[PDB]
Amino acid sequence: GLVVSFYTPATDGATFTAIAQRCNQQFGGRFTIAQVSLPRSPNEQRLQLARRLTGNDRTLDVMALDVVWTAEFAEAGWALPLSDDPAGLAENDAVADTLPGPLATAGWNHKLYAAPVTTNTQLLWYRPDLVNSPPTDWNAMIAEAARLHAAGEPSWIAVQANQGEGLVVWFNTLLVSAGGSVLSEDGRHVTLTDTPAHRAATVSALQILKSVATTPGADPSITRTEEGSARLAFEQGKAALEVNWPFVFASMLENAVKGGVPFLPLNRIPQLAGSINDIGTFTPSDEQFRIAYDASQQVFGFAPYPAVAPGQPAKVTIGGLNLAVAKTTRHRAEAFEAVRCLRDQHNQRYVSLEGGLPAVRASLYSDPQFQAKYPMHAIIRQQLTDAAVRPATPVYQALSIRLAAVLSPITEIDPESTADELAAQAQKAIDGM
Ligand SMILES: NNNC[C@H]1O[C@H](O[C@H]2O[C@H](CNNN)[C@@H](O)[C@H](O)[C@H]2O)[C@H](O)[C@@H](O)[C@@H]1O
């Protein structure tokens, strides 16, 4: 029958292809979901979609939107409100058994414009064979990287953050963790420097970025404008401390079994041979998972994101993907039906355990069979409960570009003057409304 296109980031395309294929057996030939890949960066994902939306591409049906695009797409009329479902089922489906942090990212002006499908929060990843105890705060992280550098041990702090959205994410986490915020609640004022408490938070966050950037043994790619991978730096043994999204867990086991992780040679364990399936994905039996996970715990551990203020947890910026129906669709009913299928319980288990993307369904975090294959479940749920959020604003794209340009390169941050430049550049973004 008809085709419901489903646009997703390319790096998630294989996972969402598998989910769509399952969702295609259950429609009785009524319609087919066809996954289509978007570029790698949040900005380029947005740009492709926005061009199809303003060009009235009537073949565009469902979109997996980064959480930061809700306000823009809702205000533009690009994402239909869930109340536009002709079946009247989308709003109830979106909220049922769904964690509240993800749902907050899918709303605008008191209505839902998307149904959460994946969430995200960054954890600390470390080498327990080199790091006795995982650092609990950023001053401790810096001390540990220095101690490692002294011992001729891998010394990079691998943070997912070059010159783009990931750097804004890192700054946002530090800033909110310190009690600050980029914008006011309504999104209409810049709050980086408008009170002494807010200025103090901004300066504290910038001090951490500068200190990490200039720790002995720091990654030489900080000043270069290339796009390194924190994930691969850690897997290659160049960092013993990494802060990153939880997909690094599935990557570590899979790549170790393929022989790509020097300090974790799971490829030499006979019981794991053939645990990579015919399309390249680690697909262990329960016993194979136990063997791989137990081996990995010697060289790979996880911990909460480091705090800014010692003694209480960080407030960690939330990420993820929300499913929206484009205003271009010719088939609203089928597009909202597809959204409900893509986020059902079975596909939520798959997106986390095979795809590495945290599920949004609250039940899974209380399910012992999920918890046994997703060992970071409790820290993830904790960090999703008191999450930092990036500012929700229709001019987010312009705001993020302006902030990233001030922050990068982080070796050049001067906390007091950089705080004023950040506030001035944020104001310019807000003024374009
Ligand atoms: N395949 N696992 N990768 C996870 C996820 O990472 C990105 O999204 C996350 O980071 C974004 C910032 N850019 N990071 N360099 C952030 O905006 C987003 O909210 C996070 O979910 C990828 O964009 C995404 O495709 C990946 O799924």
UniProtKB/Swiss-Prot annotation:
- A GO-annotated cellular component: ATP-binding cassette (ABC) transporter complex
Any idea where this protein resides? Cell inner membrane
What biotechnology does with this protein, per the record, is: Being a receptor for trehalose, which is essential for the survival and virulence of M.tuberculosis, this protein is a potential target for antitubercular drug design.
Q: Which Gene3D superfamilies match?
A: Periplasmic binding protein-like II
Keywords, ordered alphabetically: Cell inner membrane, Cell membrane, Disulfide bond, Lipoprotein, Membrane, Palmitate, Signal, Sugar transport, Transport
Q: What happens when the gene is disrupted?
A: Mutants show no growth on trehalose as the sole carbon and energy source, but grow normally on glucose. They secrete substantial amounts of trehalose during growth on glycerol.
Question: Has the keyword Transport been applied to this entry?
Answer: yes
* Positions with a binding annotation for alpha,alpha-trehalose: 66, 120, 245, 247, 320, 390
| Lipoprotein recorded as keyword | yes
Q: Which GO terms describe its molecular function?
A: trehalose transmembrane transporter activity
Q: Which GO terms describe its biological process?
A: biological process involved in interaction with host; trehalose transport
Disulfide pairs here are 23-341
Q: Cite the record's note on assembly.
A: Monomer. The complex is composed of two ATP-binding proteins (SugC), two transmembrane proteins (SugA and SugB) and a solute-binding protein (LpqY).
Protein family (similarity comment): Belongs to the bacterial solute-binding protein 1 family.
This molecule's function is given as:
Part of the ABC transporter complex LpqY-SugA-SugB-SugC, which is highly specific for uptake of trehalose. Involved in the recycling of extracellular trehalose released from trehalose-containing molecules synthesized by M.tuberculosis. Trehalose uptake is essential for virulence. No binding affinity for maltose.
Q: What is this protein called?
A: Trehalose-binding lipoprotein LpqY
Q: Which taxonomic lineage is given here?
A: Bacteria, Bacillati, Actinomycetota, Actinomycetes, Mycobacteriales
